[PDB]
Design a protein around this ligand. Sequence first.
Ligand SMILES: *[C][O@@](*)(*)C1(*)(*)(*)=[C@@](*)(*)[C@@](*)(*)=C2(*)(*)(*)N(*)(*)=[C@@](*)(*)[C@@](*)(*)=C(*)(*)(*)(C(*)(*)([O])[C@](*)(*)C3(*)(*)(*)[C@](*)(*)[C](*)C(*)(*)([N@](*)(*)[C@@](*)(*)C4(*)(*)(*)=[C@@](*)(*)C(*)(*)(*)(F*)=C(*)(*)(Br*)C(*)(*)(F*)=[C@@]4(*)*)[C](*)[C@@]3(*)*)C2(*)(*)(*)=[N@@]1(*)*
Lengths: 730, 730
Amino acid sequence: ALVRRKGLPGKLADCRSTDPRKSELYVVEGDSAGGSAKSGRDSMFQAILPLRGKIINVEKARIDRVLKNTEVQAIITALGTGIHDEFDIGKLRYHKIVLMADADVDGQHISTLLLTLLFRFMRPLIENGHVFLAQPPLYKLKWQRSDPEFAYSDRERDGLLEAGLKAGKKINKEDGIQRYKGLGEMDAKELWETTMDPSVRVLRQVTLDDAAAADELFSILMGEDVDARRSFITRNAKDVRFLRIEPVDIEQEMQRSYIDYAMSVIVGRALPEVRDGLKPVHRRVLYAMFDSGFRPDRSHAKSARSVAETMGNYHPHGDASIYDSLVRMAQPWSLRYPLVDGQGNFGSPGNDPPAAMRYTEARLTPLAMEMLREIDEETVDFIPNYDGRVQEPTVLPSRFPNLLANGSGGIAVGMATNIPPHNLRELADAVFWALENHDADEEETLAAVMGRVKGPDFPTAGLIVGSQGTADAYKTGRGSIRMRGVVEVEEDSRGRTSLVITELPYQVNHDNFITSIAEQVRDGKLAGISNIEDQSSDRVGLRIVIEIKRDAVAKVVINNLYKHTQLQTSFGANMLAIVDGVPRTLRLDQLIRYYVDHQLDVIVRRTTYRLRKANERAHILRGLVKALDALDEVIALIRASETVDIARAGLIELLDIDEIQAQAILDMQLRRLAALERQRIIDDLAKIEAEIADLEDILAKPERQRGIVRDELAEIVDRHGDDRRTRIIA
Amino acid sequence: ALVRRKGLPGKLADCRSTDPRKSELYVVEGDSAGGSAKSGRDSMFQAILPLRGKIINVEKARIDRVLKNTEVQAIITALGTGIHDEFDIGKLRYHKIVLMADADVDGQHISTLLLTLLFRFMRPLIENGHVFLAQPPLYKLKWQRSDPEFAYSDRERDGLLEAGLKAGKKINKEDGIQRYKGLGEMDAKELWETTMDPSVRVLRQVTLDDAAAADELFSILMGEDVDARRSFITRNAKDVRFLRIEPVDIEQEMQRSYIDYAMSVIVGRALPEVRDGLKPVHRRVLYAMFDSGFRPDRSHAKSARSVAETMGNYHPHGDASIYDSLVRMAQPWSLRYPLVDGQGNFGSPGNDPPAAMRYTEARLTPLAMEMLREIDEETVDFIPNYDGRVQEPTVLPSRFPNLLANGSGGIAVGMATNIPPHNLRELADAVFWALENHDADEEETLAAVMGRVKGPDFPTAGLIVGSQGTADAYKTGRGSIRMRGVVEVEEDSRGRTSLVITELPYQVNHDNFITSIAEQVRDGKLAGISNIEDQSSDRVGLRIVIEIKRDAVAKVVINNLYKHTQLQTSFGANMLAIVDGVPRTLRLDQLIRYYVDHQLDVIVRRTTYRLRKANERAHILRGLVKALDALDEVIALIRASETVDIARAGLIELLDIDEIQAQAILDMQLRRLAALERQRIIDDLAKIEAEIADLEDILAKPERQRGIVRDELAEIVDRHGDDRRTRIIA
DNA sequence: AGCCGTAG
DNA sequence: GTACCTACGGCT
DNA sequence: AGCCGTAG
DNA sequence: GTACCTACGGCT
Ligand SMILES: *[C][O@@](*)(*)C1(*)(*)(*)=[C@@](*)(*)[C@@](*)(*)=C2(*)(*)(*)N(*)(*)=[C@@](*)(*)[C@@](*)(*)=C(*)(*)(*)(C(*)(*)([O])[C@](*)(*)C3(*)(*)(*)[C@](*)(*)[C](*)C(*)(*)([N@](*)(*)[C@@](*)(*)C4(*)(*)(*)=[C@@](*)(*)C(*)(*)(*)(F*)=C(*)(*)(Br*)C(*)(*)(F*)=[C@@]4(*)*)[C](*)[C@@]3(*)*)C2(*)(*)(*)=[N@@]1(*)*
């Protein structure tokens, strides 16, 4: 018998029962889900404690930081047991602690973080079987005239769909299945009937078989040893798809949930695809904008519309992250070749953030259209979106080599990518060589491409010092590239010397840079500086003026700035990309080859598509010419026919043509019987037959395929290619 | 010479100049605009202080609230002069204080609030001519291949457009001209070139002619006397559109800006239109959803998409307010007849808020479709949206009497509306009478309608005590309607008496209600209560159980609850609506009549539209029959014709038909020459001619018009009408 | 501990 | 992932 | 000093 | 209108 809420957490919706043995606590992902849960629960014995998203990983955090965490405090207070040596099982307020997170890999992650907290801070709760996982449904199958059905697995969804269709139930396979990605999507009634009703619900009870084994696993998964974690996930993620209260071992739960999360982050969030150089968020935003018709030929659209359309139809995630991605693809200091044309305040290279998406407007850039060129000609694979309503492309055609041109930065689980941007003309040269020397071996190709791709070309210009770092990156996929800002020495009328900083290394925050100098001068770490002034403007660009003391040597001050500030920084190149669904550290030659392979695939697919469409068209045109030759009998037959169907059958017989051709004749407008229009049909047939011949020739001759790739890339480079900004010095 | 920051406001971007005479401070609406301004300014002399939206009205505000206001503190600190008796002009940091707010009525409002602050707290700044208003452009004309042009007036926009077109410049008919609603829409360069460059900018200098007159005006506009303000706006809003440094008198500026804001809020934000009962936000959301195809026949769409589409194409305001409006129209406890069908967490009648719009899904209700019925048949007026890209309806057809059915609540400037919801069947009865007794005078109509509309019918059910309040509201437009919750007396197994509260008055927050009782028991204001328990569930609804002491009398406790809690509350009826663009307090008879008038208008317009379309169709069909009669000559002519154009001209001559008919013949598919298809054209002509006759008869006979209105409303009531929830007791 | 870039 | 601040009016 | 609903 | 909290990794 323990007191209930009428100094416990404010956000906690407690139960009426004082008996811990009858009382249940649902720890719920966010306040949205918390609301549904609170409204749907039996308040007699079900308590609801909503959290603020990703709770602190207590494995990595100092105990002081963990105890200061508001979410951790709330959990400890709610449970009432205390922690570690002060842990008292007798004071437990709820004998069933139910973790209820969203039916997504992030939810799984939050579960893993919570289980880590309970294991490290309150182990006896797991030992004594007080910790449960709720199993909310993944899918709601909406039938016409029949009650909706709930599926808790992809397999179950497919099974129930097939069973319902066999039973004569009508769904709508497009919008028929709703995929719950967040508990906030379920109403209180649905949540109760599926997840919270003791009569219906399924709870997975967390068990602890081997404390020592569990201890080791938690260290690997949640600890600071990145290498151990990376190795754990590589060896096990291979075969994890094979590994009412249902018992589940904590070790197995942690392994499954964490590996699911890790692989999701790696293969489908944080890292670029080698062929188009796009993270999934980027691809979805650009395709959504394309499908919405936000093309360079039309007027800028409110950023909000693009974000909303993307979010609603694809990327089933937060609006902030989608908007941020969109903003970054619009920033000319972030991307060497922006993919979004922004109108309004898209932020500063300093600490000024972008305006709200309600104020900003955006559309695709001409270059972005080259990423999406002929996407409607089966040039790439399409898959069903998260819920299966619409189709989305797996990769973009990417007629421009975006991965190397724009680079990619990303933090995955147990790994990161950091690919620098490059000059389009240099990359094109490399591609042209690879096309011409298709049969060159790896060594020859590497040598050739390294000779043409001189190094990173950052949007912020500046200097690259030395070639070693670049060479290492190109040969191994890893390298330290030294970047330097540009300093000009100016002497004033009275005889004083000033350093003018005009260019900063890539990803250096202008404001933080200035503040850092000021701090260093204050601290006495930078000497010989009398005055520092920001004279930067829209009209003149970056102009930071550092006045040197009369006794100070300019060169000495410059060297100290290189040593003690981001005026000189190193770009840690890690050329990691997804290749055939696998993360790979790649050499420069490999990256070029994978791009070339993709472009060849695109041309073959485009040509195959066009050939099929040409044949379909030619088929119709042949039918029309037959009709035109027997025009009088055709018209007479149609007029004599009682029904369209009789006419159709009569035409098939009269002209020895198929259903498709007969229909096309029936669909011919009277305007087409004009002399010129008749001639046009004849001419169109001749032209299409010529096209068919050409398309067949392209398919037959790989040299023509390579030629097409070369010519079309050359066109893009002619129109969109630009001068190198970054200067390379010895 | 004053110090510049390298204890001043964090968000302030100060200037380099220490000379107040050369230094300028731009006080900017929000951080978005602040960013653009900061990036575009000349940092030598131009300081930027961004604010957090609507700064506190110091005229109304308690000194405690004023002193706590972070924005007010920031301004005082920035200027450095102090306030009132401690005001020191010599310490002024910037001799030019430039107010830069968004080119919208809200921006005008913020200006008025800032001018109120300066007048009350720092008057000498206005006296000495230190206060200026920035004048940004209204329009950006986007040319292809040519630099954009900026217009500061509608006349200037039109002039520049015509000049550019004469000069051979190409614009874009589909969003060539952008209407700036927010400074965040302008990039740094645009803002500088238009608004901040001393060489180009226009500043309006605020002057103070008569301190006493100004003092009185500020009291009227910004003070607590609502009646004085209401009277000021009614008399003056009539003729306010008639009343490089340009001087502007503070009195004139305040009057113009405040009246503009007030009228915008009154006529186009806070109050319903009498004909459809919709505030503009409601109309725009429902129409946006309609135009997007989010109909009851299709699958729920993510709330975000609806909000974004609404925001982007119409309602040029914050996403939070749009979403909140959408959520409220989905809440069955908020609306007697919900217009939005929500899926997911749309909040609770208590303190649980709705889930984020990224989780919730929404579509129109069947009843909402009755609001929008035949909107595509010129049944209502359309006007250009805020920027003129798209057309939007002024009012909805509203085939259901939404204003009275759903009610309306809103706070305008110097006024408010509070119309209670009513029973659809009762309202329909009233409408039917008004239709039948079209010529009845006001007195007769009032008597008749009051007899049929028994009183408010709240979504929360409960009780209405007495008829007086209802009668007053119906006769005057103002009334106090007493609402009461429902209490059941239950006796438990041990012999104790409990009060079970099952229904609460309209707009009573369930959680606050419970908390209020607990507080009153604690305070000793409620005696005889032993225990209070919330036994409410999704399955059983509202069930608050109050256990009474053995010595306590149930009836006494109930009466005390009615006295000291919202168990009994009064609905303050204020039946205020926009009639022909004017806010009007209306009687019940007037409200019914205005609705009936609207429905008659709709039927006449629909019939007129259908007649026109019928005639157009008949015209084509007549042409086709002529062609069918001379089929051989028609086909022969077309075949003999070199071009379609020659054929068209030949047909006009051969058949004595017009261009439209000739084209229709040319567009006829060969399938239509089948016997049945030919007959169908003949039959279609006969049918359409019958339709034309009927439509003409409807236009001729107002009795048929009233009949149509009656019948169609009756159909809606049959399908969507429901039982009275609210019980009326003596 | 604090910087980046998609996530809660 | 979450939580306050304000203008407006009319009751408490 | 605080409730409500479209606005910053 | 605005401002923090966190996971993830790899440099500082
Ligand atoms: C901003 O600031 C801030 C501060 C603090 C806080 N806290 C809590 C919460 C919050 C929030 O609210 C913020 C914001 C709001 C809004 C959101 N969203 C927006 C949007 C969305 C979507 F979906 C769309 Br389509 C749009 F358009 C918009 C964000 C966040 C805060 N805050």
